[PDB]
Symmetry: D2
Subunit: 28 residues, 4 copies
């Protein structure tokens, strides 16, 4: 289970889609 | 942004998510 | 937060992606 | 399969997920 941001390559477990989506609200 | 599973470590583009699901439908 | 299966239109909160993906392992 | 958010009830195809994220980047 994993998700990785495109510009900065940060880790987020798949069951944490809300966390990941909150990371792409803020800029990186 | 990437999609990665912790069964085989295959990566997937995020927009290509329906491909990630076809892979997860069946075991690896 | 929501996900809906294509063939049978079942509900899954977005923070439950693992549940949804397990529903498309089994057939409906 | 559909993507739906509980802020405005906009639906999205699942394969078109990167569009759902662009919508969630900004408030509604
Ligand atoms: Zn990032
Ligand atoms: Zn795999
Ligand atoms: Zn179903
Ligand atoms: Zn919305």
């Amino acid at each position: 289970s994993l998700l990785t941001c495109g510009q900065c390559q940060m880790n987020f477990p798949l069951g944490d889609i809300l966390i990941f989506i909150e990371h792409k609200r803020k800029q990186c």
